Amino acid sequence: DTDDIDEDDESGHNIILNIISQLRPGCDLTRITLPTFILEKKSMLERVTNQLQFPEFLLQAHSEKDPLKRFLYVMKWYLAGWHIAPKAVKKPLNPVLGEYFTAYWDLPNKQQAYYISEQTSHHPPECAYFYMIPESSIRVDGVVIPKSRFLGNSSAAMMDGSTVLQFLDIKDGNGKPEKYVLTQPNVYVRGILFGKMRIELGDHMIIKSPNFQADIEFKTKGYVFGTYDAIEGTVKDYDGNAYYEISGKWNDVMYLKDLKQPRSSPKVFLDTHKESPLRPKVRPLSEQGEYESRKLWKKVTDALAVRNHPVATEEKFQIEDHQRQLAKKRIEDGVEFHPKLFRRSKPGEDLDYCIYKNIPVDEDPEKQIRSILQIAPILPGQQFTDKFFIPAFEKIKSQ
């Protein structure tokens, strides 16, 4: 699979050294087009679902009665997806504005999970996603907000997005659903000058719940601290009491140490080699829309799969130049882009965007499922209608 092949040969590396020579450390990469040979065959909208491929941990969390153990399972679920990634130094395609991707999972417990996402902003880039398992009262909303940076020998996507997880049938002290906020580590590429490129996850990831929190540092390989991919973090309450220390590597084995029993050794917490991922399902291509991820990028990804980069580049240009023309018209007409599927949040809320459709917390799961399926085609055989293309803000006025 080309996602796992490094195509950074001498000619290719020369192309990158070339680009690197125009930039000053600290600048962003919004002005330049990276070559196609550093692309994996997925839109960022779909790459997000890699992170959701271990729903069993989430289902366990939801069924776990003890608040602290429940927190741990959420942390386990959230950490599990990161190693599901290209083996080569490759990144997902930057989605076009209004691009959308939907997917579902048929879960071991015979329920379904549903996923809807859309690219809501181009300058600066942002996409929003929504994921729900109504039959288990589990709801997830989030956004990706990548800020690209050239740093010299390094570059990065500084990840400012976050995720909100809610257990709808577990009420907190307010009578509201138990809520977790989870942030994202930064994604670095090192060795863009000297030697071979390598991706590292980078700084701090935060997980907050009503009763517990964790701050997890994704360690950067020394010089003196010479190992890749390690994490270190503590699970605390809000009175400063530490319960567990997490350690290990996000792409190998992670361990938890019971700080209450300091004689004990760290115990296996998540072994990424032993856990089997569950991949999303997607409607057939013939059923997908013009700006639906896999269909939109199909000619690009076909060319990528056979390593035909002149074609991949040409196909990517036609798509991206088309979007440039659409953006010009908008400015000419005094109009702005408005997402189809996500409504803008009010100030002081957790996320820039949330799915537009009202899905009452205590509504029967069967009714919640029908509401979800009315938002966009997700399951095989579903159809588009004009409503889909109406902006979210117009659809919340009717609601």
UniProtKB/Swiss-Prot annotation:
Region listing for OSBP-related domain (ORD), in residue ranges: 19-356
Gene Ontology BP terms: endocytosis; exocytosis; maintenance of cell polarity; phospholipid transport; piecemeal microautophagy of the nucleus; sterol homeostasis; sterol metabolic process; sterol transport
Subcellular location(s) of the protein: Cytoplasm; Cell membrane; Endoplasmic reticulum membrane
Give the misc comment: Present with 2550 molecules/cell in log phase SD medium.
Q: Which function does this protein serve?
A: Lipid transport protein (LTP) involved in non-vesicular transfer of lipids between membranes. Functions in phosphoinositide-coupled directional transport of various lipids by carrying the lipid molecule in a hydrophobic pocket and transferring it between membranes through the cytosol. Involved in maintenance of intracellular sterol distribution and homeostasis. Catalyzes the lipid countertransport between the endoplasmic reticulum (ER) and the plasma membrane (PM).
Give the molecular function GO annotations.
Answer: lipid binding; phosphatidic acid binding; phosphatidylinositol-3,4-bisphosphate binding; phosphatidylinositol-3,5-bisphosphate binding; phosphatidylinositol-4-phosphate binding; phosphatidylinositol-5-phosphate binding; phosphatidylserine binding; phospholipid transporter activity
Entry binding sites for a 1,2-diacyl-sn-glycero-3-phospho-(1D-myo-inositol 4-phosphate): 29-34, 91-94, 122-123, 316, 320, 324
Give the protein name, as stated in the record. Answer: Oxysterol-binding protein homolog 6
Organism of origin is: Saccharomyces cerevisiae (strain ATCC 204508 / S288c)
Q: Which PROSITE patterns match?
A: OSBP (PS01013)
Gene3D superfamilies attached here? Answer: 1.10.287.2720, 2.40.160.120, 3.30.70.3490
UniProt subunit comment: Interacts with the AAA ATPase VPS4; regulates OSH6 membrane association. VPS4 is required for membrane dissociation of OSH6.
Q: Does the keyword Lyase apply?
A: no
> What effect is documented for mutating residue 316 to A?
Does not affect binding to phosphatidylserine
An example GO CC term for this entry is: plasma membrane
Keyword set, alphabetical order: Cell membrane, Cytoplasm, Endoplasmic reticulum, Lipid transport, Lipid-binding, Membrane, Phosphoprotein, Transport
Q: What InterPro entries does the annotation carry?
A: OSBP_sf (IPR037239), Oxysterol-bd (IPR000648), Oxysterol-bd_CS (IPR018494)
